[PDB]
Amino acid sequence: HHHPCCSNPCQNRGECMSTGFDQYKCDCTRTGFYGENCTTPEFLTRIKLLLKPTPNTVHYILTHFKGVWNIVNNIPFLRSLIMKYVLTSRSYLIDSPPTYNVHYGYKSWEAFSNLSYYTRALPPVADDCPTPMGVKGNKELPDSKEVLEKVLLRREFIPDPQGSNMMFAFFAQHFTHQFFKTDHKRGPGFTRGLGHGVDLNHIYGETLDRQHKLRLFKDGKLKYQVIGGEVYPPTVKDTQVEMIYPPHIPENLQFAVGQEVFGLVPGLMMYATIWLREHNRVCDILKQEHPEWGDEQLFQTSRLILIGETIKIVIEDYIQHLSGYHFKLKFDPELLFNQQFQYQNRIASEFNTLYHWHPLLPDTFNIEDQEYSFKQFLYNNSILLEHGLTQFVESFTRQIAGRVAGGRNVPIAVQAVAKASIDQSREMKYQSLNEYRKRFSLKPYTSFEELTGEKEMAAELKALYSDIDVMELYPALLVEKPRPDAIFGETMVELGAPFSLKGLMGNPICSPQYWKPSTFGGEVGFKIINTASIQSLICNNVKGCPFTSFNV
Template sequence: MSSRKQANLLNERISLVCLVFLWISPVVFATNYGADLVKDDNERLFLRDVESHILETERWLHEQAGQDGTDGELFERSRRDPHDLLMQFGFTHMMSDRMANAVRVLKNVSSTYSERTLSELSGPAKRELCSAAGVDYTVSDCPSTSIYRTHNGACNNPLNVNWGKAFTPFVRQLPAAYADALDNPRLAKSGEALPPPRLVCLGTIKDAEKDHDNSADHWTLLSMHFGQFLDHDVDHSALENVNCTCEITPKCLPIMIPSNDSFFTAHCFKFQRSVAVPDEDCNTSPRQQLNQITSFLDLSQVYGNSETQGKSLRDLSKGKGLLLSIDDPNSDVGHELLPNDEEHKDCIIASPQLKCGRTGDARAAEQPGLASLHTVLLRQHNRIAEKLSILNPGWNDEKLYQEARAVCIAMWQHIVYNEYLPPLLGSKNMAKHGLQVHPTSYLFGYDPHVNPSISNVFATAAFRMGHSQIPTTLLKLDRDYAEIEHVKLDETFFNATHLVTSPGHSGMDAFLRGMIVQKLLTIDLLLTAPITKHLFADPEDGQGLDLAALNIQRGRDHSIADYNAWRKYCKLPEAGSFDDLLDVMSEATVSVFRKTYESVNDIDLFPALIGETPERGQLVGATLACLIGEQFHRLKFGDRFWYENGLGEQAFKKAQLLEIRKVTMARVLCDTTNDVPTIQPYVFRVADTGTPPENAIKSFYTYSRENHFPGDAGDMPGFFNGRVSCQGDDNIPELNLEPWTEGYVDVTEDDGLDVPFGG
């Protein structure tokens, strides 16, 4: 027997053992988890007393609601006020409010019985106490079958059924850096207060009134829009739903504006703190924050984060597994639009028939680029579901929906790792973190001990790097890629009028064409005025909010450690002085940090991350590459439903996986737009013009299978990215859904899926 055959046989045996384990373990571990009972009689009596006190506290808090000043009043709307739009963007689910109330109850209990007494309770007792207060992160039962993902992310991991689930705390890779080890924001090394966030911005970040010349060579603005859409798939913290003023309270942490500010005249930016929740062990100190959505790359921004929400987004009337949609009222032909969100009170509507769209995420209408990508993925799901219904007329609505959802999620994961991440991180970091996709093989690298949950630092600082890539205007192009207009970003916030299809403007298609032509801005300390001065302003050129200042304050709210601590975490030398930062920053950047902060140990993480000089062949600096790479490693190897995973009943057939690997973002745009006749095969990269060199590869699908890219200098030698027809061009292959036909005979090992890899 050949060595290859022996290796294949060994892998099949390993697969069989692991598969049996994955089938039985969800039931075993979920059952054991629920049977973890409190057995100590004294502890049981104590718990009864505490639970009685919890009920008394809940009654008292209910009576006091709205009577303790600004901090206790529910947020009242003021249409189109910047702070109100910020609350719309930071939508807080009622589940988050319930958890926040539970923390207040538990803190009251702690003050009565002492932290020490409660900390000495056993794990089961603590969980029971948490449950009595209204918080239960645990899952007692998992579905009997694990072919499809749950909408809330539960039961993905058979050993830790709650990892990655919606409404669980962010994970911390470094301890919280609260000044009092409880919940007060970090202080400077000297013990004094850190400089106010707006003052930090004035000292370190330059405003750009128009798009600056610092464009990232070769890459398109689609990367920025795609990054925001991706971020909304994996993290969303909850904000306290209260009216804040310029007074610091337990729920409010206002950003004070210097009296000599050159632009803002208000005294402060109102700032609601993120909801405080117990950690997974039911400790309320130090303060911890909540992720309201699933951590997995599961298109939850399209499908929702609970079974109830998921069902509300479906069109159950046709029996084809479709998502709800509406026809474009301004077009006789064309693809469907997102259904109207009738509860969105801050949307500028295009007409009574066309409002901001309703999706699986409340932030979809924030700007037209984001809304366009939501629409694209809605159309993609419905397109696939329709085709599956033709191939499998015996499948019911649920089967068609779940299969189409699984295909779309797999395509999404493939595009994220095969197209979006490589230019961001560079080929060196892609290899370092095991992020490269394989051209032919299954992945046998799933690890149930890898926690895929989103880290606090990723959500609060690292993946906000895209804010530095936001342009001043959004480009709209016609079908021949001629300019229609530049739309000012600050007039598009929660504004549905820009997606209207009209003669000469072509609505969403015009924005999508603009995304794949407009150049991506570099990640640096130069941010555009629509987000540093006019964020959510009404009128659009008025005083809005400063997004950079909000990011810095959110980092302090979540007590993210200082930049130097994260350098050390990422194996960079710990800086003893500002000059030691010159290994990853320019002299000009180090100079502005030296003038703004008293100590090198005081620097807030967000401005430092975007201040790092991008390393050769990538769009980010060293610390950002570390934090982003590590998170995407965990999202890949900690996801049992990862599209390349060859173990378990959820695994795709070999032929199905080969088809999914054909998918590119260019193909998705071709299939879901009304009028994009030509497109470049790699839409994250600007289109090449002229005559292609001899023997150049013109298919991104082919090139990405044969090359680790980008090159050391960020280039793609041997690839020509010229525009080709969307219809019938082999350079942008189409997905063949025949392998999803009931009874389809799968391909054999000799057909190309026979070499296992482990990342």
């Protein structure tokens, strides 16, 4: 006798509970629905469901009428009202305090309190269910190698029509790997990022012992070295900071930074160097305002400013670019001060899964007159030293990235990574694509052709999975029909955006007792946060101040 909730019977965020070996009950508290399966809508619910516009209608409005948006963007009262709507509309979607995890399909103190887990937006399918997705489909899911090969692997390179470049692609990797840090000794549902958010541990280190080995202990600064007159991160041998390097890397090329894996990719070392310089620049600025401060307060206040700069850039440059909106997004914590909102966050497993954007990667990495293969590029920081940061920024600003949704664009060099995303999803017992769509208030797909918008890939998928209701989440995100001339389809935006909001606005520095000039050393440090940009980050820290952007 299998678990009676295995068919996911309760709808509209109702919670399922076994009441016997072969019976269940649904808890409809505060869903706005009632009945055995929480499918009968209450009166006000009927009215609310007739005035709600679709995600695709709202997307259409924000990506047209540029003349009307140019008006709106220059009326501050109107701009804050719309940005307030953008923030609050996606609030109700994330459980906070968090609930489930890979080991707990019911709420428990272990799931609430153990920070080594990723949390879960949907609870896992129970261990004794008759099929992998519950009751639907066949006894085993299709071979992941067949899924990968038929609809995921890149044939010809498909460029992103939104114009994303390699500055964007490496910013994504650098930024997200402060909170996606899987503890593979324990398993794919466990994390080593116990801060669960934007704490900049990828610059300063996750533990105090690592931070102190990275710090200079003069003027608040981080340790550094000088090569050819340029400032780079220090070495492993000088700091005793542990890093992951193949055994053939020379000691002088073993750079030491907050995140142990950033020596793997020269694009990650580019941003690690930029942010190290930015920290020491802000220390210089704070010392001129506060000659009376000691090393500890200079260091700590610089870190808070850089956290604020990160959130500012991610909202007003990074998300702004991804969105495609004509409306100008705004980082303004005061918009939430009269709203109900929880200043806390727990990183969800499914946020990690949807962020596996590996179609972004090009076939070769083009710097100046060179075209490096994957094998030449990995673990080779000599390329950074040979070319320099100015040439990296100028080259990466010009090279187009790949399109993520729309199918068949994962580079063959990382085919094993893509296969692992499928296999670990199943290992963690994820529910199906259509279950996740309902969870985020989207209509379930009725066919594979509806999923993809074409015929050839959908027919491959139909032969593999047979029922659209057992299609898996992660391959679906990469084959989904994209928005018109966009990098993503609907499922990626509507799942990614609420997770992202909580991680940015949930930071304590956005709470009322923190969001004050004195928190950042007075008005001068505050203004650094509120004027930050990807362009100013590069201009202040890269020789020659080259122009840059997240688009080609």
